Each structure stands twice: as structure tokens, then as C-alpha cells.
Amino acid sequence: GPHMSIINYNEGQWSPNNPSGKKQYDREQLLQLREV
Amino acid sequence: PHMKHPLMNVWTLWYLENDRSKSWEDMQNEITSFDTVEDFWSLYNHIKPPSEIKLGSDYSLFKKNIRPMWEDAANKQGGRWVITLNKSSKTDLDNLWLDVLLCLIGEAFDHSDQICGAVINIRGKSNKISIWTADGNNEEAALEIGHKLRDALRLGRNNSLQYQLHKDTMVKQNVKSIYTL
Ligand SMILES: C[n+]1cn([C@@H]2O[C@H](COP(=O)(O)OP(=O)(O)OP(=O)(O)O)[C@@H](O)[C@H]2O)c2nc(N)[nH]c(=O)c21
């Protein structure tokens, strides 16, 4: 399944390396995180 | 070690089970609240999809502290984008509801601050999915959410959008539509 290290984050989006980014997630992004 | 992805809002899942021995409010059951993508999935993954819950039941996902009812102050001056479904399959039903939930928790709307929650009604004749917004008089926000809904959701020649003010549907227990997309 999808690997946390390869999750793509848009510019300005929240990420574990960008706590200030917007907490907005696309549909495909949310489905991507459905697997631990 | 695993860092969860926080959502812009805290959301609460409600499940209504028809029970005439109780008032409608008391039919609402607060399940759990979540504020991360992972915790949403931990909830959704292990609850029945809409196609499997009892007839007469609802699922409602609303921002924390907003009850899924007209009386709540966040919904008094609001309305809902109603999506009457034309007897689609179970997967189409469930995928539509999930996509709605992902629109909500993912903050897909420009006027996401106007979003209060969403309700799916599982009924015998036809099922119904509604997105509740805060201010029905806010035409700019109602249309943006409406346009964004038919865009993020698969355009359906068969199913249309109907925006109904809560002030109206509350009186008529038959109900006028103030927008149509
Ligand atoms: C959303 N809602 C529904 N009800 C009750 O539930 C009824 C509507 O029920 P419903 O909106 O849950 O679905 P239904 O498909 O049966 O609606 P219908 O097509 O009009 O038949 C109302 O007549 C009320 O008795 C509500 N009653 C209160 N007090 N507050 C609410 O916000 C509310």
C-alpha cells in the first residue's frame, strides 16, 4: 500500500514537514492515507 | 513515530435510528469525533456503509458542537443542498456519501467556513444526501458550494441539486427549492 515517505504534498499544504500549511486535502490524498 | 494529518475542523459522526418511542432529537446517536485523516478512516472503515444501515436511519457528519438539526444556532439561518438519488446501486450510493465526507473533512470548498455538515437519509422510496450550510441568504457561498459539489461529485444528468432553506422545510412537515444546479 501507499508509503508515508512518498505521500506527495502540494505547495502550501500541511505536511509533517510543514505544520503551517493549509489543512486541506484532495480526495485522492485522503484515499491515499486510508492505509496505515 | 507515525504523525497523523490534522483536519481543519473537528467533525462528529451522528447516526439516527428511527424509533417512534423517542423524540426525533433522541433518535440521534453521537458516535465519535475525529480531527485527523487517520482517525476519520479508523471510524469509517469499521462502520456500515449507507447501503447497509436500517431503512429510516441517517448518517450525519457535522463540525463539532454543531448538532445535525434545524434548531442548532449554526443551522437556524442555513439551508441544505439536497441530492435526491434515483435508486442507484449500493456502491454508487456509498461512493457518493464517502466522496461527500471527503469534501467536508478535506475542506474542498472556498466557503468551507459556511459548511455545517452533511446528512444521508436511507429510506425505502429513495435515498437522499444533503450538505447543510450556515447562511441561506449567502447566495455567493450557496452557489459556490453547489457548483463545487456537482464538480467534485460525478456530474449526473439524472440527479440534480436542490437548495432548500431550513426555515422553509422546518415549517412544511411539498418543499420549495430556492436554487437548482
Ligand atoms: C431534519 N429533521 C427531521 N426532523 C423530523 O423528521 C421529519 C423529516 O424526516 P427526514 O428529514 O429525516 O427524512 P424523510 O425522508 O422521512 O423526510 P420527508 O421526505 O419529508 O418524509 C420531520 O417531519 C420531523 O418530524 C426534525 N425534527 C426536528 N425537530 N429537527 C430537525 O432538524 C429535524
Swiss-Prot record, chain B:
Residue range from the parent sequence: 80 to 259 of 259
Location (main, coarse): cytoplasm
Subunit structure: eIF4F is a multi-subunit complex, the composition of which varies with external and internal environmental conditions. It is composed of at least eIF4A, eIF4E1 and eIF4G1. Recruited by cup in oocytes and in early embryos, preventing the interaction with eIF4G. The interaction with cup therefore prevents the translation of key transcripts such as oskar (osk) and nanos (nos) in some regions in the early embryo. Interacts with mxt. Interacts with 4E-T and Thor.
Membrane spanning residue stretches: none
Function per UniProt: Recognizes and binds the 7-methylguanosine (m7G)-containing mRNA cap during an early step in the initiation of protein synthesis and facilitates ribosome binding by inducing the unwinding of the mRNAs secondary structures. In 0-1 hour embryos, forms a complex with me31B, cup, tral and pAbp which binds to various mRNAs including maternal mRNAs, and down-regulates their expression during the maternal-to-zygotic transition.
Consequence recorded when altering residue 41 to A: Disrupts interaction with cup, eIF4G and mxt
Name of this protein: Eukaryotic translation initiation factor 4E1
Chain sites annotated for binding mRNA: 24-25, 70-71, 123-128
UniProt keyword annotation of Protein biosynthesis present: yes
Protein location: Cytoplasm, Cytoplasmic ribonucleoprotein granule; Cytoplasm; Nucleus, Nuclear body
